[PDB]
Each structure stands twice: as structure tokens, then as C-alpha cells.
Write a protein that binds this ligand. Structure first.
Ligand code: V3R
Lengths: 300, 237
């Protein structure tokens, strides 16, 4: 089990760890988060009491270093810092676990939620979408725009998701105009899976990473990307049967985890009703359709 | 964005544009089979592509062979219209290519947009106007070349005959839309109006009769009477 220690909590904040969250009061004795399952990526995120504007947070993998959180009073946020002196990290963290100053990552043993939300998410691929090579962890917030959104203005602070555009030469073979626009299998399978993502596990990891940036930070452009990657599969007549089965599981847990009160903003009517009812895959996402119908029959 | 009465005059400025109507591309008769079922038989169609400023009409005849063995013909028709508009643009010299193409039905927008990706600098626009170009097949010479064609074929017309010698594009477009609207609402009366007087003739290289300015006013008035009336006969007023 790994540990995210905190230098102190000088400002009142809501702290998120993966799908959990808890309130910390200003200058309450608090020195971090213990018992974090090794082996998964994690996200630790922050919403200040005084300004619900700007959620922000750090994607990280405990195998890639010792990482602590420290409040910066100049830039005014909780920052992720790495302590390379391993023996000193073991000691300060032991010092805090002895004084019982750490909240315990509250995982239920029956619970495979975070696993099933992050199945294909790799820290290596995250770092290619969020470019700040000097750090092993990656910062995201609510207001960060995407590469594609920057085409429609600080590139260092962008989310470099894979650009998907259905009315583009990439997506449409000369002389197959109707065919490829109505049945996107060639964009999905040749251009994207074989050409760019190399495999569907990388496809799925971006898809999942987009959804989670949408849910945790309200990052609008991440939501666009999530729906675009769903749409390209739903809009393809020819998809490997194993991709479909996995997509159905992937979406099922995403829909399950979505807060019911955020569905109005986060879910795109047009995309979902196409996947579930109109498109080639209308009959292939049984679990996703069952939860979408029993939980959000309104959107449909 | 979309075209309407508030930006109506834009059509006669000096930016090359084309209207595209697809309403007569896929045409069928519906009939009963020996078994008492119903079946369609297709007939030849056309794409009506029109420069509103010059009156040039690029009539692309759609021969029924283009449907043999095809499924979902109504959807295919839109895509086949886009493929043929696009080919027409590519055949034109650059200085002749339109800067805007306006579709008369919004369902054409994605099909044409997709076929015209290679022309990022041509705007593909819809319109809110309810233009009566579907009635283009009530013009006898147009209907004739369409129904006689035995193979695909692009025929060129000036839908304004010689009008621009004497009137502005604005006014020639206005006359054309009134004639076509009359044709659409009551083709028989519309046609009686136009040919009643046998001294007025249609010149071999024209589509409409050779009316003097004075006769045109009479004609235009009579077409208005028709359109209001049939709008009465229709809404009882
Ligand atoms: C910023 C200093 N050089 C390190 C102090 C510090 C404080 C709390 C930690 F958990 C940690 F890992 C390091």
C-alpha cells in the first residue's frame, strides 16, 4: 500500500482521491492519504471551499516515485512534488502514520470500480496527452482546453487528445464519400486503431482518461473527446466482437459512476441515442442500454 | 449561415454562387403488381444547379440506370447529387468556381460538405426560403431533354433567356420565382396563362415566350392572381 502525504492543509478544501472525496477544514491537522492500492493509476484532486471555480488535480502512479502534496501560498493551490530522498520519505510518512494524521483510502474489498474505470489507463499514455515532461505526475483542471478546441491558446497547457473529425479527409477516402461517412469502419479500424492508436487498449485508455477528466474536473473538451470516441465505434458497422464486449463493460461502469445530478450536462443525447437505438451497434451494448434505461430514461 | 429574406440581395452581388436543388433527382411512379402489391418504377431525373446572377443552369440529367441494383435510393440520391455537383466544380476553371453553394434542402448539407472537403474555401449553405425549383420539370423543354435522355448527360441552359438585356438579375430572379411558384401551385392554369396568345412564341433557343415588357407585366399580374387564388381555393378565403 502506498501513501500521498501532505505538508499541511492551510486552506479549507474538498479533497478527491480516485472516486472518493472528503472535506478538510482550514488548518485542520491533516497529513495525507494512506493505504492507496498499488498497481493502479490514481488521481488526487481539489476544490477549494472559497472558490468552487477550477477543480484541479494530479494523475499519478505510485510505482513511479514518492510524491507529496504541499500548499503553495503564492500560486494558491495544493501542488504535487516528488521527494527523491527515499529514506527521508519513509521516515516523515512513518512519523505521520504513527501520529495517525492520515486518512485511509477507503477501498471496499468487493469493489472493482476504480479498476473498471481505469482498466486501460496507463501513466505512460497520460503523459503524452498532458505534456510536462519534467514531472512524473500530470496536472489537469477544469479550464484546460484540447488540441482540437485550439483549432476552433497556450499549447503547453493543452490536452493533446487524438483529433477525431468525421468530416475530414482523414476520415473519408476519395471516392468512398457516402460509404465512409455513413459506415466509419475504415476511419475506426484502419486510420485510428491500426494507424494511430496501434491497438484498442490504447484507444480504450484514452477514452477512459477523457471520461474521467470530464467527470472529476468538468473539463468540457474531455467530454467532447469521450463522446467522439464512442460515436466512432457506434457509427462503424464493422468492429471486432471483443472490442464491443469490452466497450459495453467500459461504458456500463462509467454510466454507473456518473453522479445522477451531472447527467444533464455530461451526457450527449445525440450520441447515446445513436449508439443505443439507431446505429449499427443498437443491439450490441446490452449492459450499457440496461443501466441507461433504468437510471436515465429521461435522456432517451 | 442560412439564407433568408434579410440577406436576399446577396445573391446578385459579384461573388459566384450556385443554388442546388435535388428535388427532381430520384423520381418514381408507384404502381400495383400482378400480386396486388405495390412497386415503384423510376423515371429519369435531373439536378437543378443555377447561378442566380447570370441565369446559367447546369442541368445534370440523372438516367434511371444509375439506380439499378442500388438500395436506399432516396439517401443515395443526395449523395449522387453531391458527387455530381462536386464533379462540376472540379471541371470548372478556378476563376469560375463558386464561392458559395446553397442547397435548397438541409439534408443536402452533409453530403455536399463531404464531397467538397477538397474545397475548404467554398461555403456550403442552407436557406430558409421556400424556393419553387421543384417545378423546373413543368418547363417543357427541360422536361423534354430529361425524359428523352438514354444516358447520363449534362445540358446547359440560360433559365433567363435574354432577359438580362433588359432587366437586372434581381428582377430576373424575381420573375423566375413567380413563374415557377405559379407552375407549382396549379401547373395547368400557369401554363394556360403563358401560352394563351398564339402570336407570342418561344424561340428555339429559349425556354419562355418572347413577351414585350408590357406583356410581361400582364403575365406577372396574372400569375399573382393565380397564386393568391389557389391559396384561396386552398384555405377558402
Ligand atoms: C519540500 C521539502 N524539501 C520536503 C518536505 C516534505 C514534506 C512532506 C512530505 F511528505 C515530503 F515528502 C517532503
Amino acid at each position: 500500500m502506498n501513501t500521498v502525504p501532505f505538508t499541511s492543509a492551510p486552506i479549507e478544501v474538498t479533497i478527491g482521491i480516485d472516486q472518493y472525496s472528503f472535506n478538510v477544514k482550514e488548518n485542520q491537522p491533516f497529513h495525507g492519504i494512506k493505504d492507496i492500492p498499488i498497481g493502479h493509476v490514481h488521481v488526487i484532486h481539489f476544490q477549494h471551499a472559497d472558490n468552487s471555480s477550477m477543480r484541479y488535480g494530479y494523475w499519478f502512479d505510485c510505482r513511479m516515485g514518492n510524491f507529496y502534496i504541499q500548499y503553495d501560498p503564492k500560486d494558491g493551490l495544493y501542488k504535487m512534488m516528488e521527494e527523491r530522498d527515499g529514506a527521508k520519505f519513509e521516515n516523515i510518512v512513518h512519523n505521520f502514520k504513527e501520529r495517525q494524521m492520515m486518512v485511509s483510502y477507503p477501498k471496499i474489498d468487493e469493489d472493482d470500480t476504480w479498476y473498471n474505470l481505469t482498466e486501460f489507463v496507463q501513466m505512460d499514455k497520460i503523459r503524452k496527452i498532458v505534456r510536462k515532461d519534467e514531472n512524473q505526475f500530470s496536472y489537469v483542471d477544469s479550464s484546460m482546453t484540447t488540441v482540437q478546441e485550439n483549432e476552433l491558446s497556450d499549447p503547453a497547457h493543452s490536452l493533446n487528445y487524438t483529433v477525431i473529425n468525421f468530416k475530414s479527409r482523414e476520415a473519408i477516402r476519395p471516392g468512398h464519400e457516402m460509404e465512409d461517412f455513413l459506415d466509419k469502419s475504415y476511419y475506426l479500424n484502419t486510420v485510428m486503431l491500426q494507424g494511430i492508436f496501434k491497438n484498442s487498449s490504447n484507444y480504450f485508455g484514452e477514452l477512459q482518461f477523457a471520461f474521467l477528466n470530464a467527470m472529476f474536473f468538468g473539463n468540457y473538451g474531455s467530454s467532447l473527446q469521450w463522446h467522439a470516441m464512442i460515436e466512432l465505434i457506434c457509427s462503424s458497422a464493422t468492429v471486432p466482437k471483443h472490442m464491443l464486449d469490452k466497450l459495453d463493460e467500459i461504458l456500463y461502469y462509467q454510466i454507473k459512476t456518473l453522479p445522477e445530478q451531472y447527467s444533464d450536462i455530461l451526457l450527449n443525447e445525440r450520441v447515446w441515442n445513436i449508439c443505443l437505438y439507431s446505429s449499427f451497434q443498437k443491439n450490441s451494448l446490452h449492459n450499457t442500454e440496461k443501466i441507461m434505461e433504468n437510471k436515465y430514461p429521461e435522456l432517451l | 449561415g442560412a439564407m433568408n429574406s434579410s440577406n436576399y440581395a446577396e445573391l446578385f452581388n459579384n461573388d459566384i454562387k450556385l443554388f442546388v436543388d435535388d428535388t427532381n433527382v430520384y423520381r418514381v411512379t408507384v404502381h400495383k403488381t400482378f400480386e396486388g402489391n405495390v412497386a415503384t418504377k423510376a423515371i429519369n431525373g435531373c439536378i437543378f444547379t443555377l447561378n442566380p446572377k447570370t441565369g446559367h443552369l447546369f442541368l445534370k440529367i440523372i438516367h434511371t440506370s444509375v439506380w439499378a441494383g442500388q438500395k436506399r435510393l432516396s439517401q443515395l440520391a443526395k449523395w449522387k447529387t453531391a458527387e455530381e455537383v462536386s464533379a462540376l466544380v472540379r471541371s470548372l476553371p478556378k476563376e469560375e468556381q463558386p464561392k458559395q453553394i446553397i442547397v435548397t434542402r438541409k439534408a443536402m448539407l452533409d453530403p455536399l460538405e463531404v464531397h467538397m472537403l477538397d474545397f475548404p474555401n467554398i461555403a456550403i449553405r442552407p436557406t430558409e426560403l421556400r424556393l419553387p425549383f421543384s417545378a423546373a420539370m413543368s418547363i417543357d423543354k427541360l422536361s423534354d431533354v430529361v425524359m428523352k435522355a438514354t444516358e447520363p448527360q449534362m445540358v446547359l441552359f440560360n433559365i433567363y433567356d435574354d432577359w438580362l438585356d433588359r432587366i437586372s438579375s434581381y428582377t430576373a430572379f424575381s420573375r423566375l420565382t413567380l413563374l415557377l411558384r405559379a407552375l407549382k401551385t396549379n401547373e395547368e392554369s400557369a401554363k394556360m396563362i403563358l401560352l394563351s396568345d398564339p402570336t407570342i412564341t418561344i424561340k428555339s433557343y429559349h425556354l419562355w415566350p418572347s413577351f414585350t415588357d408590357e406583356q410581361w407585366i400582364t403575365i406577372e399580374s396574372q400569375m399573382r392572381d393565380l397564386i393568391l387564388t389557389e391559396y384561396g381555393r386552398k384555405y377558402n378565403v
